[PDB]
Amino acid sequence: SWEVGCGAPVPLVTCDEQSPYRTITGDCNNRRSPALGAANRALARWLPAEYEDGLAVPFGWTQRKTRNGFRVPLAREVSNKIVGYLDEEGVLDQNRSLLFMQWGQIVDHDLDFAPETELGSSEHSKVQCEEYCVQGDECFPIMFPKNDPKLKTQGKCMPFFRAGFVCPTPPYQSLARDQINAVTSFLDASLVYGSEPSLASRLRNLSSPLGLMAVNQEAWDHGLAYPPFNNVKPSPCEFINTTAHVPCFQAGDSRASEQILLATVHTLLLREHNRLARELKRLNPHWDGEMLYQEARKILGAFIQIITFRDYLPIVLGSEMQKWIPPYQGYNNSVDPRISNVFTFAFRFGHMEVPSTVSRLDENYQPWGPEAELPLHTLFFNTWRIIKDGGIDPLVRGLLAKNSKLMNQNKMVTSELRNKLFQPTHKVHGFDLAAINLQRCRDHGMPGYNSWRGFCGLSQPKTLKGLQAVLKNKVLAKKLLDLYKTPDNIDIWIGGNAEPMVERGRVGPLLACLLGRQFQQIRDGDRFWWENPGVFTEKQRDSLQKVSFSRLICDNTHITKVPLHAFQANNYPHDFVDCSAVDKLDLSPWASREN
Ligand code: HEM
Ligand SMILES: CC(=O)N[C@@H]1[C@@H](O)[C@H](O)[C@@H](CO)O[C@H]1O
Ligand SMILES: CC(=O)N[C@@H]1[C@@H](O)[C@H](O)[C@@H](CO)O[C@H]1O
Ligand SMILES: CC(=O)N[C@@H]1[C@@H](O)[C@H](O)[C@@H](CO)O[C@H]1O
Ligand SMILES: CC(=O)N[C@@H]1[C@@H](O)[C@H](O)[C@@H](CO)O[C@H]1O
Ligand SMILES: OCc1cccc(O)c1
Ligand SMILES: [Ca+2]
């Protein structure tokens, strides 16, 4: 830390100490160090950043600057040679529902967001990046290799802008550059409520003292609500269909409409808040607008924590879950709650779980209409298919009855993401998420694969033969070394994902360690963790223990047949029960007496 502490962007915020509620920003969770875990601060560095100049220049920036004596391969070349595949047949995960992928994305958005840098709206440099592909300042274009089909139809590169960093936004020459996490590190439903005071208030309904979240006033789903529209233009949800004129949703997190199933789960979560807020007011008529909002917010936060740690993590981490996330032993004010920079790449394992299509299903869980199944690329920034084509129920049924993609060393990332990605402001369904990930690895100054293996106590292969053994795959290891020339240079996103999965899990040993450590930290380092004594009464906890995603579905949609365990692969009718067989959330313990 060249300076003993760089913090010019908001160092301020008075701490309450008497508050039973979290701040919107995450400040004041940790009493000794109140900025820890708060939004718009640097991502934590678990290892020192690795830049070609030691400070800020990404590896790959200068042709003539090697990493460990070898040129780094183009991100898109790695994507084409390693990450892509043609045949979608046989790629699905026979024991994870599509909800498993989807919940991952939700959790991710709760924990981290490193926004692409600001520096200007009215930019000649935007054209310079996109139209001319000239690298400079925050433009760091993804150059196509020779033989790339995209060279024939899309020009010479994909645009790419470097992430924002603290002391923030023009270049500085201090300790190494740290990217910003714009959301709260805590698992706290910041994706529903926001991590900033402007947004958080804009999302609430302050026209009535009921503690409700604002809802769309233009469209309804069989009498159930949608999020408000975002009426700032240009709107990518309008751009993908200028006939329908259906804008993006507005949600605690700016990414909520990135694809239709994310927007779908966001809508469920908004619905749950208002459902909770209405029950609380009925149970506690005296309660004012603020306390309703806050008590509802507190419950929803616990919901996300429980679903995540009880149901989701054990089937991601499998046999490693015990080793990294043992049983909760209480809040620990020494633990660093911040999301680490590497975690934002590790958690991108979910990209390899996204399948190539999305289905709308009817009440018999048969295809909903003649175009029930849609290619995923037509569903980026697509809100019109929700509002104009059956609402949420058909998509939720698909989330329950369809499968996630299985990660596969020879079928890594679906072409829907790898060749067809839509990015707002750019006009085409023509980007490559895997190339973006790799380029972003470099932008953030990530240490390589072997540095992370050492970090996790795992062997550091230096040879082809050693890499074959770690990957349990000769052909993959050989492709990777042909590109990277030393395992020391393999980008963490691809190195971590290339490892065979652990038993009963869906990530390899390296990622399980990285993810495992991070999740242990956001639990043990959270003063408002749901199971921390003082946060919820014992009675409130016994009620919270029975939450489930199936119950979330049942309460907030007109889906009446659900599985007991919604993350595993479930088939209809054999694996589905009526909602009456699913435990309710008993909110009687929130009844507050007075007098
Ligand atoms: C159809 C599904 C998905 C799409 C279209 C999508 C798209 C994207 C895009 C465009 C980015 C920003 C890339 C960059 O500029 O660096 C991103 C980042 C990310 N994605 Fe996804 N993604 C999807 C699913 C998932 C899943 C399933 C997970 C995890 C289980 C996940 C985790 C992440 C994470 C951790 C980041 C980095 C967030 C940050 O700190 O800024 N994504 N994704
Ligand atoms: C048929 C089968 O493999 N069932 C397992 C089940 O034992 C396990 O508890 C569950 C966790 O989600 O994952 C399933 O794949
Ligand atoms: C923008 C918005 O959501 N306005 C709703 C309004 O439609 C509703 O009638 C009122 C009272 O229940 O609560 C407001 O929040
Ligand atoms: C290219 C495209 O997606 N066109 C759809 C069209 O099929 C639909 O009838 C219309 C009305 O919702 O919305 C448009 O966006
Ligand atoms: C009782 C307890 O939790 N002790 C741990 C201790 O092992 C360690 O010093 C630190 C982890 O960095 O967190 C403390 O709270
Ligand atoms: O899912 C992340 C994402 C990606 C691109 C644009 C967005 O607004 C959000
Ligand atoms: Ca959060």
Swiss-Prot record:
Q: What is the lineage of its organism?
A: Eukaryota, Metazoa, Chordata, Craniata, Vertebrata
> What's the further remark here?
Thiocyanate (SCN(-)) and hypothiocyanite (OSCN(-)) are bound in the distal heme cavity. The iodide ion (I(-)) occupies a position which is stabilized by the interactions with heme moiety, His-109, Arg-255 and Glu-258. Hydrogen peroxide is held between the heme iron and His-109.
> Cofactor binding mode, per the note?
Binds 1 Ca(2+) ion per heterodimer.
Phosphoprotein among the record's keywords? yes
What family classification does the UniProt entry report for this protein? Belongs to the peroxidase family. XPO subfamily.
Q: Where does heme b bind?
A: 108, 258, 351
- Organism listed in the record: Capra hircus
Describe activity control.
Answer: Inhibited by small molecule methimazole (MMZ).
Q: Which GO terms describe its biological process?
A: antibacterial humoral response; antifungal humoral response; detection of chemical stimulus involved in sensory perception of bitter taste; hydrogen peroxide catabolic process; response to oxidative stress; thiocyanate catabolic process
- The chain residues annotated with the modification Phosphoserine are 198
Question: Which keywords does UniProt give here?
Answer: Antibiotic, Antimicrobial, Calcium, Cytoplasm, Disulfide bond, Glycoprotein, Heme, Hydrogen peroxide, Iron, Metal-binding, Nitration, Oxidoreductase, Peroxidase, Phosphoprotein, Secreted, Signal
Listed disulfide bonds for this chain? Answer: 6-167, 15-28, 129-139, 133-157, 237-248, 456-513, 554-579
Q: What residues bind Ca(2+), as annotated? A: 110, 184, 186, 188, 190
* Active site (UniProt): 109 (proton acceptor)
Annotated tissue distribution: Mammary gland; milk.
The lineage's top-level taxon is: Eukaryota
* Catalytic activity reported: 2 a phenolic donor + H2O2 = 2 a phenolic radical donor + 2 H2O; thiocyanate + H2O2 + H(+) = hypothiocyanous acid + H2O; iodide + H2O2 = hypoiodite + H2O
Its name, as the record gives it, is Lactoperoxidase
Biotechnological and industrial applications of this entry: The lactoperoxidase system is used by the dairy industry for the preservation of raw milk during transportation. Freshly obtained milk is supplemented with thiocyanate and hydrogen peroxide which are used by milk LPO to produce antimicrobial agents.
The keyword Secreted belongs to this UniProt entry's keyword annotation: yes
Q: Which cofactor does it need?
A: Ca(2+); heme b
Q: Which GO terms of the molecular function aspect are on file?
A: calcium ion binding; heme binding; lactoperoxidase activity; peroxidase activity; thiocyanate peroxidase activity
The UniProt gene name for this protein comes to: LPO
